[PDB]
Structure 1
């Protein structure tokens, strides 16, 4: 199905033979089920979960009630997962990191680090024009953006400067190294999106 978890930086695990494997430490606290959606009401089968612990004055009544229907404590934020026919869950149930004890590889979704207004060189890997040899005010500029009379227009999806990052991106099939049940961790190989403290949706690899 999937679990929500805060990113907690990066480390490495040294395997006894020698290999140091760079790991992302994802803390995965008790993901508790706030709602179960089904074909009768909603037209599709899913579960809504929560995690963390939001202070009571910061949570609003419309959500405070929403948690009181389940009976769970008010976690910081809500996420939904689609069920794969066979599995079935109940409201108020706490899903733990022990689901990933069986799996080998995981898709990790997160929000990428925001680079702000990025130019074409940074954003699209556009090539810098000649740094000298006569060049006039046009070193890192994008160059041409179209043809002439014929279109007489720039085409849609033309790679230009603009907002880079702060976008939801998914890194697929990362190898799970260790699944610590006691501290509630999930060590995956490689790097996943977003900064330390960002929320990650970790789930089993679709590309088996």
Structure 2
């Protein structure tokens, strides 16, 4: 009835052995999935208007500046795809939703810290457990066989993506920091009233309206940034350079999807469909893909002639 953990009863000799054993199994399992197209892939249909393909899960490496050919400076966020695989596929009818969904998980984690039901799910899948699992709505033609890895080249420079992540958590906060309230004067007689809400309602109603802005927990919630341009792709390290900043702290997992904004509808005609298969790819992609307007690091210094 007392709780236990994985190495509680292990001896000095067995702890290193177990760590090495489980570590090697994880690496071997990841290496066995590197050839999706030689392992009975599902049908690869052509892209059609109205088709929605799967997205990725990436990690927020940090922020970096790049310069366009006109000389403007744009700061970008580095998003690295780490151990991203398709986990589960649910048909349109069974999802209970308008479209079929594809579950994707990224970032490998320790098996010792996962639940039994989760562990046995990954055992039949033949993959190590993932820190985060996200559900992507897709069309029938875009279905991918579970266990297929996904890379950063799935996204190509010049397209727009939507990034969703949990924001930085600031805990319980006052109305000034949380809601941008003006507060009260510092001097001129103010008595213990500088950062207080003030009046929260009118006298007649005799109650506080639901949804009233009050002190409370701030941050640590899911937010989406829409219409972020993909400036550059690094195929060697699988890092998607995206315009602007994304929600959440660096080293957090983010959900990357094709942009939903109406202006960017039906721009996937030239994008990999259903995804990018590096093994299938006839000609290996260059280590860096650049948008036409980006100043590449080795390009000559800008001249306005």
Q: TM-score, normalization: structure 2?
A: 0.64
2:146 to 91, 112, 115: 91
1:43-98 Cα offsets, whole Å, 9 max, x none, are 34111122222223223331121112222232223221111343121111112222
Are positions 1:157 and 2:211 aligned together?
yes
| Among candidates 88, 91, 95, match of residue 42 of structure 1 | 95
State how far apart, in whole Å, the 1-side matches of 2:116 and 2:210 are. 44
Match of 2:37 in 1: none
Alignment map for 1:38-117 (pairs within 5 Å): 38-44=91-97, 45-101=100-156, 104-117=159-172
- Stretches of structure 2 that go unaligned for 5 or more consecutive residues are 1-53, 265-305
Distance 2:160 2:110 in 1: 35
How far has the Cα of 1:186 moved from its partner? 0.4
Kept after mapping to 2: 8 A contact 1:103/1:204: no
Matched, 1:123 2:175: no
The residue aligned with 1:180 is 234
- Which is helix-richer, 1 or 2? 2
2:249 to 187, 195, 202: 195
Q: Which moved more, 1:100-109 or 1:131-140?
A: 100-109
Which is higher, the Rg of structure 1 or of structure 2?
Answer: 2
- 8 A Cα contact 2:181 2:197, kept in partner: yes
SS in 1 for 2:130: coil
Moved over 6 A (4+): none
Once the 2 structures are TM-superposed, how far is the Cα of residue 106 of structure 1 from its aligned partner?
1.1
Report deviation, 1:34: 1.3
Contact 2:108–2:131 (Cα < 8 Å) also in 1:
yes
The alignment's TM-score, normalised by the length of structure 1, stands at: 0.92
Distance in 1 (CA, whole Å) between partners of 2:93 and 2:159 is 34
Deviates more, 1:152-161 or 1:90-99: 90-99
Higher relative CO (Cα under 8 Å, sequence separation at least 6) belongs to: 1
Distance in 2, Cα, partners of 1:174 & 1:55: 32
- In 2: Cα distance, 1:112 partner to 1:182 partner: 29
Q: 2:225 aligns with which of 148, 171, 181?
A: 171
Aligned-residue CA RMSD in angstroms? 1.7
The Cα shift of 1:17 comes to 4.4
CA contact (8 A) 1:171 1:193 kept: yes
Distance 1:162 1:61 in 2: 35
Aligned partners of 1:34, 1:92: CA distance in 2, in Å? 6
Aligned pairs, number: 207
